[PDB]
Amino acid sequence: HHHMLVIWINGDKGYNGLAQVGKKFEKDTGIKVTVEHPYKLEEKFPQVAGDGPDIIFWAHDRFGGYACSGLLAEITPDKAFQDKLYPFTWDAVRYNGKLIAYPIAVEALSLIYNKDLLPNPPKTWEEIPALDGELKAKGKSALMFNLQEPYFTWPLIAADGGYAFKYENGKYDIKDVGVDNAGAKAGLTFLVDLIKNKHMNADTDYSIAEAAFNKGETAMTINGPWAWSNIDTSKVNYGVTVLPTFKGQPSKPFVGVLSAGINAASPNKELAKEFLENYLLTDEGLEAVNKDKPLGAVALKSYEEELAKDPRIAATMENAQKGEIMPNIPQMSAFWYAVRTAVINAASGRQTVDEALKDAQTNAGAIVTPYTIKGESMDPTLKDGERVAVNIVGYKTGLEKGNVVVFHANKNDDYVKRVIGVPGDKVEYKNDTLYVNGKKQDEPYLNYNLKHKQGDYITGTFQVKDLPNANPKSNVIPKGKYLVLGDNREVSKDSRAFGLIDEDQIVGKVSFRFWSHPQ
Amino acid sequence: DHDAHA
Ligand SMILES: OC[C@H]1O[C@H](O[C@H]2[C@H](O)[C@@H](O)[C@@H](O)O[C@@H]2CO)[C@H](O)[C@@H](O)[C@@H]1O
Numbered sequence: 463h464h465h466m467l468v469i470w471i472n473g474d475k476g477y478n479g480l481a482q483v484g485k486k487f488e489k490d491t492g493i494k495v496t497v498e499h500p501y502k503l504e505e506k507f508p509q510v511a512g513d514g515p516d517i518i519f520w521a522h523d524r525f526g527g528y529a530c531s532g533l534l535a536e537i538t539p540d541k542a543f544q545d546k547l548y549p550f551t552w553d554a555v556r557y558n559g560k561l562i563a564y565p566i567a568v569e570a571l572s573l574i575y576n577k578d579l580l581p582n583p584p585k586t587w588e589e590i591p592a593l594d595g596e597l598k599a600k601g602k603s604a605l606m607f608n609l610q611e612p613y614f615t616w617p618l619i620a621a622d623g624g625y626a627f628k629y630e631n632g633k634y635d636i637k638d639v640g641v642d643n644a645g646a647k648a649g650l651t652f653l654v655d656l657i658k659n660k661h662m663n664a665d666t667d668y669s670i671a672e673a674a675f676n677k678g679e680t681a682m683t684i685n686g687p688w689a690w691s692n693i694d695t696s697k698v699n700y701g702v703t704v705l706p707t708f709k710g711q712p713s714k715p716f717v718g719v720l721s722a723g724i725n726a727a728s729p730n731k732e733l734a735k736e737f738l739e740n741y742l743l744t745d746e747g748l749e750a751v752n753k754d755k756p757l758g759a760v761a762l763k764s765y766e767e768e769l770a771k772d773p774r775i776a777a778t779m780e781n782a783q784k785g786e787i788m789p790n791i792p793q794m795s796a797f798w799y800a801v802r803t804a805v806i807n808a809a810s811g812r813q814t815v816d817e818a819l820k821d822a823q824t825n826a827g828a829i830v831t832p833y834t835i836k837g838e839s840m841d842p843t844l845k846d847g848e849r850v851a852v853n854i855v856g857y858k859t860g861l862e863k864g865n866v867v868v869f870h871a872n873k874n875d876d877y878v879k880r881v882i883g884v885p886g887d888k889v890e891y892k893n894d895t896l897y898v899n900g901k902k903q904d905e906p907y908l909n910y911n912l913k914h915k916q917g918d919y920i921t922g923t924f925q926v927k928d929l930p931n932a933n934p935k936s937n938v939i940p941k942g943k944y945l946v947l948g949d950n951r952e953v954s955k956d957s958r959a960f961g962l963i964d965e966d967q968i969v970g971k972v973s974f975r976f977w978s979h980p981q
Numbered sequence: 982d983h984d985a986h987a
Contacts, residue, residue, distance in 0.1 A: 831983060832982075832983065833983045833984065833985045834982055834983070834984050834985070835984075835985055835987050836984050836985065836986045836987065837986050837987040838987065839986075839987040840987035841987070844987055846987070852983075852985075868985045871986070875986060876983065876984065876985045876986065877985060877986045877987075878985040878986065878987050879987075948987060950987070954987075
């Protein structure tokens with residue numbers, strides 16, 4: 463808890479080097495420093511942040527989501543300190559006007575190649591098929607890299623025109639997503655073609671690709687500076703160079719800035735600040751980490767003037783220049799998840815490229831907001847206190863019968879009920895039997911309440927035409943109106959009492975996990 | 982925390 467620091471950093475980074483900086487800090491101050499590298503730490507952090515590390519290391523892209531959620535302290539570096547780091551690194555860690563992390567290092571992917579298998583790396587993605595042909599002849603392959611994380615395939619996807627969210631007039635437009643445009647389709651198609659033609663395997667992941675390259679089995683890989691240490695150990699004669707072009711266009715990697723945030727709930731914020739500013743972000747601190755696993759082009763000017771000398775760093779920055787700084791907006795999480803699914807599905811054959819990217823386009827922009835359920839009127843479908851995810855609906859967008867919707871009841875109160883009828887639907891109840899457009903409709907979500915009722919009927923007979931805001935001449939639901947009922951029908955105050963609601967009151971659809979799925 | 986009344 464109190465007289466110590468717990469730090470999270472990813473498994474692929476120099477965590478032993480960071481721990482040595484932690485030992486120096488313990489020597490000087492008596493404050494113990496524990497460095498952990500949990501699997502999927504970037505997803506776990508919100509879970510635990512309630513506990514959780516005092517300091518969390520990740521690429522800057524995740525931090526706006528963390529900050530929006532109130533999980534991060536605003537950092538308070540003075541001018542003198544701010545001047546020690548490149549201005550553009552500070553830009554990566556600013557969110558809603560405030561600094562929310564300490565930038566550490568600029569990361570971009572490069573093409574890494576074995577000079578003994580391949581003295582001249584290919585200028586173009588288009589050469590790789592032939593090249594693989596030649597290399598297969600001697601029991602080798604041309605190219606292996608991690609296909610499970612879209613970070614690694616994004617440079618190819620963006621080459622001919624893909625993008626995440628358009629940045630225009632000083633802000634990102636969350637509605638302008640570049641995932642299923644022509645450029646993205648061509649790139650992902652070429653990737654799938656490589657797999658179809660057995661020049662790559664769809665199951666290749668980080669460790670498989672790294673082992674292959676470091677054991678001399680593949681001529682090329684795609685990875686960041688962190689990977690160079692293991693290659694040094696392997697004695698592969700390697701080079702780090704500019705990524706090939708695709709359709710004449712440079713590959714465009716998403717550039718990250720490894721950043722260090724301070725938990726908003728930490729009682730050691732002052733120690734965290736001391737550690738980061740005066741131990742880590744020094745020539746000596748960065749060197750210790752860098753010596754373990756290279757950081758990339760560091761944020762600290764004094765040390766970067768040394769590392770910029772390295773040709774491999776010159777390559778890293780060259781690839782960066784053709785790419786783009788990741789957005790840090792909260793929507794990034796949804797983007798990456800959408801694009802991970804799309805690549806995996808297109809590569810495995812589960813979907814075509816058009817299908818995968820059409821779904822990804824939709825999912826990357828779909829805004830999701832957490833809500834807490836209050837009351838028992840949706841029981842047992844939703845319970846009092848239940849945390850749910852709510853898919854925000856665009857102003858005049860596709861609501862459907864069965865959807866459970868959050869809506870504004872008044873200026874202060876949001877309600878949640880199930881859509882039983884949409885505009886145009888003719889609806890009534892005869893006892894507990896639902897009739898929509900002349901057909902009885904089963905309501906399996908009421909099965910429990912139907913079989914544990916206090917009364918004769920849980921919903922009871924009624925007709926739309928008798929309800930507030932209805933067409934009193936018709937059971938057909940008016941234009942822009944919706945019939946909503948609570949699943950706990952016996953106790954629910956819903957359209958039976960307050961009538962049809964308006965389309966403009968609806969905020970989103972509640973997402974449900976279905977208990978069953980394929981194995 | 983956004984709350985929704987069931
Ligand atoms: O693949 C999606 C993933 O991309 C980036 O994660 C990188 C990270 O920036 C690197 O430092 C390195 O650890 O590899 C990761 C990919 O496995 C984003 O930073 C991350 O948020 C995103 O989910």
